[PDB]
Design a protein around this ligand. Structure first.
Ligand code: ER4
Ligand code: ER4
Ligand code: ER4
Ligand code: ER4
Lengths: 341, 341, 341, 341
């Protein structure tokens, strides 16, 4: 019992936000998801440490998942804060892993490698085009979408058919990662070395240097560039709706809907707002609470996404460049929503 | 009309959950059970209220049922909040009561009296032996099983052969009560004054002072006594199944299954759980939602009780000495379960 | 009464359907047919445990029919569900046995033995050819035909000049059994350990791996392999009609016509259907409701059979590999039905 | 001492291909390689036997490596020829295993267990994609390349850095295992039941039924497919050239180079050759004698490899489909060789 407790204790300590949503699931579902998260967290931890040689990463990450069967493996000099204790006591994670159904072990191990390999691809090349941006997000978010979906099936809580086409599942992950990449633009831009995710194929149409946006000036394009990033994100919404409306199990739904609705609300805020280049754009605790409270069933869930979407569209002028691309990205979204009510 | 609307309004107020389950019954049977619950409720409001003297209770309780024919009666000095209001306006209960079929009225009175007496017995003495434990749960729960079963037969929805041996009916109520007694340990002991139900004949083998389970120091002995308790409740599982399998009506079944399935799920969570000693362990709103949805038919019900049963035996370790008492009990439970598939 | 009650409350607990058809019969024969069924199922239960030794079967099976007196018998560690209860409390079957007339008693014994050995012959061996097929079905199903036919005779209800030739009596059994083997495939293929009854001589022509059928990428050949199975079945049809036509007792006809009609209906549904490889295919409640209702006399029976035989021919087209063939088999069937109108 | 005798004895009886290259190793390292082989050999005998329930393999194969410490362990009746005698007296192995550098023991156990679970993972599922193919070859061959590589470093004969990247080592195993699968096509497709490894993602393009590759009628699409397989295998060559060129110890190089060269020689003979679909194409013993004699030095090895890679290419012609892909892969392997000269 000491193993699973260490997992949940470090989970809540390294990702309190997500640590709350995950408590929507129960029994073995939450157990697997918890371990699944920690593994990917450990993986990303190593891949994020810049004091680690590139080669070491290029040959260790690809076989990271192999340590999932070695109940003796662990690290000692890596990890930021509590992220350290996770790698130093990984034994608890792997030992808990070996208790999950053989079905859960595979999805986790499989995704861990696929993601790890995807990370190695970007450890040697920059993110220039949108394809790169969509592929990168697919590795750190999209695949996460695949894994979870494969879990709802292996659990028997959802219809086996939910895993034929994972396009939407991938969309579920992209909507979150992108909404995040946008908001967390300032924190990521100043860090040394600077971690950039915004594709040159999008910001180059606005500036020569990206780290020139902090400056209160150029603020006119910063917005236009930001909106371009938002629009690019509003593309996944329609698919997000489709994926949610395909969920039947109440537990699996709340765990899948809460993050999405939370993202749409986040976008409706960061959209067409300069304050994104200087500080953290967060939703009010009241909005956070309610979302976590009503996103238990489709209807009410679609009912909120529908609201935030309008509060996103109803914030720009026909003078703002994207009044068109958005006016459609909004209808396309609302449509999908209206087609399930 | 208005009396009924009060009873149903006070119901969801004093006990939401049950107020949702009771909706599984038809207006006919529902009106009776709702009043049956409020009677036993107002009765408990007197027993559990330590703010008043014992000579007041042993004076009022014994003749509580008699008040059912006095639509004027009411008590205005016992209980807290809602429950307190239930007594000050007990009139509505008796009102609607007089509007019930004689058959129902009598069953509600017989149980109210027999329970009232039982409460008095344990009102001037504690629970030391297991027999005490069982006998008590009988007076406050087992009898409810008898009453309900009698109401089912009386109504005609269930066959008369059901009331031949109220043994399994008693088991139904015991499984629920024991599960609650096991979960609300910390809450009941942090009561002023402390409320204890765990039979001395049991904790006596793990500590001389039950209050030691609150301190982590005795975490081992605590969880070791907790598992002993859970083991005591598993004895009723095989019987609960039999009773649920003897029900023919779809409405009565659901109303009888849901609670049982909710208890098993809860029992699988608090099993070998130490959190039980510092907080209240509960199922996820989503899981309790999945239970209300499928506890409509026997089979679907049996596989849920099965799953949760297997979950209980899984969270078990071979290292500790309770693994044996249980392994044997889980089999008798799963056996009886498969014994109907 | 205490013994038959058990025999009935148990019969009604494993084959709800047959437990409804058996009531078409008369008290004298019903009680007999009932015990006759139980004994056989009690037998199949022994012949169908995969967590039980082989040298236990024969050593115990061929002494099965012998143990049908010795009212002091019973097996405590056999099957699952109610079945094991039938064996752990087999006693009620042996006294209700003698309690019952003996003209039948001998028939039960005769087959009970024959069938048991037929099962022994196949325990270690398996089905490689259609010869193994028709043979196996003979022991488990065909013989039930001989039996029932015999019981019919000895009861004076049917002509003694009917137990002379038993060919058709075997066809009734094979048809019923073979139809179940086709419909209950996925259910059997998923048995753990696996259960196979399909002639190696047949699927060796549409594939090289039977378990493969679970696939969705072998369909085309899987269905035509199914068509072949159905084709093989339709060979008994003409002989089924003939038998039903000979029966002259209203009560004995219904009990012998419904199962057949139910089979033809099911067979006319599984034919050229892929759904058979991922779920059980069964007649709608309304369809089966009409079957029990009309299959009381010959004419009505022959008409439904025909109707269903004309729905199995409506699913195929010229492009089919068994098309021009089945039209032949479908004819031989109708011809027979049409020669009694 | 007497036990290593049994080990080498059995070794020379079971494996006639590797037995020679192993015997030529340096005593110390050799014993571990001998036992390492005998271990995997015992494991395989289990997976490759069709008289065992696959329901008990999945439950015990993953435990097989545990017996490596229990000198009293052995298996009663499984496997034929000498392989049977292998487990019956598996003690000689385990006791010889005991007296080996703990490092060697850890490597054998690790690979053994990992390979075992890989077999179970492929006992239920089959090879449909080119992923299942590479993954399967990985479990039963790539891992062997891992173990040996680990054993090399463990002995100190090779630099500790040889274990850094095990990707090339994996390529080593795949080149051998694949060449055999391609060469043993006929021998395998004519089994009871049949054995197949050629990925559907490849042959589904050249036929509807793989078995159709035995008829002179489908001789055209048979070869065209065989070429697809050869190309797939020719992908691992470049890495093979790299791994060999990384070995510094003569003993290790000879043992590693010979098998690789032999495979390429065999591949150059089966390529575009159609006798494969009915006979077992092989290298003349005089050729495998020339290879053993010269594959002791890098340059000599690279040379032989090149000339075998060249004639494999000088086999196809313009009118051949694979012509283009072969050139690329061939010249790709060539360049790798000329790179180390
Ligand atoms: C129904 O579809 C569900 C789609 C979920 O989409 C995604 C997308 C990205 C993430 C994430 C994340 C992290 O911030 C946490 N750790 C894993 C990747 C990164 C960095 C370390 C996550 C969070 C996540 C991570 C691991 C397990 C579950 C969920 N989910
Ligand atoms: C088919 O068998 C049915 C067995 C039902 O078993 C149980 C067991 C315990 C309870 C309860 C309860 C209470 O908390 C609510 N009130 C009545 C007894 C106590 C205190 C006041 C109850 C809830 C209950 C009580 C009265 C009426 C309906 C349901 N049922
Ligand atoms: C007028 O001709 C009548 C032909 C009846 O043909 C058949 C064929 C098969 C069966 C059957 C069956 C079982 O599923 C039930 N038990 C007996 C054999 C198997 C397994 C255990 C049965 C059902 C059966 C079994 C026992 C007694 C009566 C009928 N009948
Ligand atoms: C320097 O890199 C060396 C790469 C060697 O590549 C490979 C690839 C495949 C095999 C093999 C094999 C087997 O047929 C024999 N047994 C082990 C795996 C299978 C089945 C049972 C083997 C043969 C083998 C197996 C065990 C010990 C030594 C060699 N080696």
């Amino acid at each position: 019992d000491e193993d699973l407790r260490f997992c949940y204790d470090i989970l809540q300590a390294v990702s309190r936000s997500f640590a709350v949503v995950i408590m929507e699931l129960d029994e073995e579902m939450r157990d697997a998801v918890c371990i699944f998260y920690l593994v990917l967290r450990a993986l990303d931890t190593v891949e994020d440490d810049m004091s680690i040689p590139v080669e070491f990463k290029l040959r260790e990450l690809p076989k990271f998942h192999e340590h999932l069967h070695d109940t003796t493996w662990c690290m000692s000099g890596v990890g930021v804060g509590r992220e350290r204790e996770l790698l130093e006591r990984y034994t608890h994670v792997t030992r808990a892993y070996s208790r999950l159904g053989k079905a859960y072990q595979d999805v986790i191990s499989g995704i861990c490698e696929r993601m790890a390999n995807g990370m190695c691809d970007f450890l040697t090349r920059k993110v220039e085009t949108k394809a790169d941006y969509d592929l990168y997000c697919h590795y750190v978010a999209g695949l996460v979408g695949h894994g979870l979906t494969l879990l709802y099936v292996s659990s028997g809580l959802e219809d086996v058919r939910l895993a034929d086409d994972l396009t939407n599942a991938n969309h579920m992950g992209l909507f979150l990662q992108k909404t995040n990449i946008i908001r967390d633009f300032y924190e990521d831009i100043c860090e040394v070395p600077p971690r950039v995710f915004w594709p040159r194929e999008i910001w180059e149409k606005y500036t020569d240097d990206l780290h020139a946006f902090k400056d209160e000036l150029h603020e006119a394009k910063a917005v236009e560039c930001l909106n371009a990033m938002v629009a690019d994100a509003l593309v996944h919404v329609p698919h997000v709706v489709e994926y949610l409306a395909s969920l039947r199990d109440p537990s699996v739904f709340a765990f899948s809907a809460i993050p999405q609705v939370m993202a749409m609300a986040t976008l409706s805020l960061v959209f067409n707002n300069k304050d994104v280049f200087h500080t953290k754009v967060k939703t009010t605790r009241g909005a956070t609470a309610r979302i976590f409270h009503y996103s238990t069933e489709l209807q009410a869930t679609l009912q909120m996404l529908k609201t935030y979407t309008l509060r996103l569209a109803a914030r720009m002028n026909a003078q703002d460049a994207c009044y068109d691309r958005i006016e459609h990205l909004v209808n396309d979204a609302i449509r999908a929503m209206e087609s399930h009510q």
